[PDB]
Amino acid sequence: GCLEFWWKCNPNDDKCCRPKLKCSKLFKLCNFSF
């Protein structure tokens, strides 16, 4: 997609493209779903 897991993201553009990826508050990066 645009950016894989780990690869930090932003709440304005977002980099999490994976169906399970999403800017998590864990460390401000595309965290998994599991």
Swiss-Prot record:
This is M-theraphotoxin-Gr1a. Negative results: this toxin does not inhibit potassium channels Kv1.1/KCNA1, Kv1.4/KCNA4 and Kv11.3/KCNH7 (IC(50)=53->85 uM). Disulfide bonds join 2-17, 9-23, 16-30. This cationic hydrophobic peptide acts on a lot of different channels and has an antimicrobial activity. It blocks mechanosensitive ion channels (also named stretch-activated channels or SACs), without having effect on whole-cell voltage-sensitive currents. It also affects acetylcholine receptors (nAChRs) through interactions with membrane lipids by prolonging the closing time without affecting channel conductance or opening activity. It shows high affinity for lipid bilayers. The presence of a 'disulfide through disulfide knot' structurally defines this protein as a knottin. Expressed by the venom gland. The modification Phenylalanine amide is found at residue 34. It is found in: Secreted. Belongs to the neurotoxin 10 (Hwtx-1) family. 52 (MTx4) subfamily.
